[PDB]
Homo-oligomer: A and B are copies of this chain.
């Protein structure tokens, strides 16, 4: 019969002044609503992003049209079909206020929102044919991708004279176009390649996918530009952009307008032909009108000592903003090529929008969210004194030094595994020839496009710049997310214990510090923005940017989980932003999306791809799940989670244990492959569980691999304590390791196995299978949680030997916590808190503060916390979160 319930969704921070339609997620309790038999209303457009094991809705997405009316909150009421099929009430059926239509043929696809009409060719070298406003007025055309590169690089500036450079230009070439059409929003996904326009023959390269989100009643289009780096040693990217033509034919030069966003809400306001600050005044109204971007009165009405001499007032065709560092931008204009540029008063951080158009012809604004943070970038207006202007956003500026992704070192004469692991001992880098390659990394950039029937106010531009740099987000309530249990059971809301309250303040301290380090230490850049470093250098007073494994962190010890669970518990905007940016880096730049190592990611190093440990614990899709669902099934992360389903194939091309393994095994063709049951498997399982939850094109496969491998672990005599296994890539089964073919019993322990998502995947896995869980899997998992830090005797009693090199006791305290909850054992719960307060990691009497450093010790002033590293704070914070969720009933108890 009838089942209905409601969920409220809030703006992430302050109520916005403007939105351009938004998408959000909502979770639903297990078994409550069936897919396709469930209606949603707002106080609404809807689809499923995930499902529970019995096929009931786990997560949905929802979309709202652009609207002047903006609420403090929004309530979605779900209703089963039963609610309408049981009432005999007549009820009205009307068309929505606004609604998208799409016309679709051989040549091209067109999307009309009511406020713009945009065309997408199905082939060719032009992504957007044109953009019309309501009236039918074309305001921009031939949107296209640009790429520029060079064949080599001089050793230094002096070497230019003796080291010639061959420049090439490329075009975005379309191969496929897709549509996910709905009434309230429509998504055009465009896939392609870059092909040569100018320079020597060059194979097509730099695969792209560009996603356009259009919303009903919106002239604002959001653009997810994703590219994959398939260059070689010889391909140096020089320039990477998005370019539109803006037709100005018909606008008097003095009615053509140029705007750049400046610093903090600022706007640069100029005309192609400037009527202000001349020796003679055409009239106050006329000057005011030009600064306002309005069409000027008829030339007969001006003071005539100006209209007669327009011939003598220069015309400014080209404009260039370049932000080549995180801290300063240049701005210049010129009459036309063959003349010098004139410099313009500039400043620190440009907020990343430019507009070209006119009072009568209309025009177009383009921008990059997070502009200066993703340097080096730029904005160019070109040929604004012609019939056709060009507006270009540069995702990578040619005014920068070229992008060099080659190895930072030659290998220092390391010749083989023995030399490599010896170098591991001093810099923490695990180098190997040919492993230090950026081949297959990706980066996604969030772009916005704004159409205008006419040059808009500067207040409007500033307001859209702010929109672009802080996209409004609607999220469900933490309490609700928790209650549904649709994003794990291992966290909970913030208890009256004064101890618990000092834990909360400590997580807040950790977050605040990590947030400030991003600014202080300038972790900004085209590729770097979003990641942070690993360990600190207390003497130099810097993070170890230049020492092997101590530099970029690359999700080591699961900081992605701490920061995401920290958002879930709290609803903090800063917390969401920190995490979002993290996830946009980690999941794109730190992982390979093509080639033999597709679906692995790279271990922490000096470059994001320098190290030879290529492992699924970096690609670990559990790190993206929380964002996948909260964003409303963000499609690019969507795509990324699918790529990872090919991770299991890697183990035939690469053994992560190749240099340390003692059992003589190597991959060989058509053979069982070796992978770890902790680190690697937790990566695999997470990707399969997610495909299962999504009921995507490989879900039956995913279900089978997960179930079979789970069952395989259950069947190992020592379960998780075994360490690894041999997987069959054809039968999708998991048998014992090469040293234990009879399954007599094997023991191989690693401090790393639990701390890259294992407890999280396993518990979710367990809840998902329910009564179909293979016999003895929960017990094997409990065995590991309990014996990890039981006594040496107890370990020896169960498995034949004590556990040698167990560390990360704080980190693993959460496993005892989990088992304590599940066995209802108070003594075990007390163990969990003891390992938290009185083993390793961050001890409760650690300094727990920042020291300020300045003067001649350091380049710029900095706050430091030398007493911690990222490994510590990630696991400390997970421990806090998970110990509170499982064993807070036992916390006060511990404290007495």
Contact = CB atoms under 8 A, between A and B. Distances in A.
Interface of A: 146, 148, 155-162, 165, 167-169, 198-200, 238-239, 260, 262-270, 274, 276-280, 287-288, 290-291, 305-306, 309, 311-314, 316, 318, 324-331, 333-348, 380, 382, 398-399, 401, 404-410, 412-414, 419, 422-423, 425-428, 457-459, 461-462, 521-523, 525, 528, 535-540, 542-550, 606-607, 854-861
A343 B280 contact: no
A324 B169 CA distance: 25
Given A280-B426, A287-B539, 20 more contacts: A160-B167, A160-B169, A161-B199, A266-B855, A266-B859, A267-B855, A267-B856, A267-B859, A276-B537, A277-B539, A279-B428, A291-B540, A324-B328, A328-B329, A336-B410, A338-B410, A339-B407, A342-B607, A345-B521, A457-B856
Given A148-B157, A410-B339, A425 B279 contact: yes
Given A324-B328, A345-B545, A427 B312 contact: yes
Contacts of A422: 309, 312
Contacts of A148: 157-158, 160-161
Nearest to A372: B328
Contact of A528 (B146, B269, B343): B343
Nearest to A318: B156
Nearest to A348: B327
Contact of A427 (B160, B169, B279): B279
A595 to B, nearest CB: 20
A312 B266 contact: no
Nearest to A329: B325
Contact of A340 (B267, B408, B457, B458): B408
A425 to B, nearest CB: 6
User: For A263, A327, A422, A607, which residue has the most chain B Cβ atoms within 10 angstroms?
Assistant: A327
Contacts of A425: 279-280, 305, 309
B858 A314 contact: no
B267 A407 contact: no
Contacts of A340: 404-408, 607
A290 B324 CA distance: 33
Contacts of A309: 422-423, 425-426
Contact of A325 (B330, B334, B523): B330
A84 to B, nearest CB: 49
Nearest to A406: B340
A200 B164 CA distance: 12
Contacts of A380: 156
Contacts of A404: 340-341
Contacts of A199: 160-162
Contacts of A328: 324-329, 348
Nearest to A423: B312
A155 B267 contact: no
A436 to B, nearest CB: 10
Contact of A539 (B267, B290, B407, B521): B290
Nearest to A263: B860
A333 to B, nearest CB: 7
Contacts of A274: 540, 546-547
Contacts of A547: 274, 277-278
Contacts of A345: 521-523, 542-543, 545, 859-860
Contacts of A325: 324-325, 328-330, 346
Nearest to A159: B337
Shortest beta-carbon contacts, A-B, top 6:
A328-B328, A161-B199, A327-B328, A277-B537, A262-B859, A325-B328
Contacts of A269: 540, 856-858
Contacts of A278: 426-427, 547
Contacts of A347: 327, 522, 859-860
A59 B287 CA distance: 54
A161 B149 CA distance: 9
Contacts of A544: 277
B539 A268 contact: no
Contacts of A457: 856
Nearest to A428: B279
B277 A335 contact: no
A319 to B, nearest CB: 11
A486 to B, nearest CB: 40
A510 B233 CA distance: 58
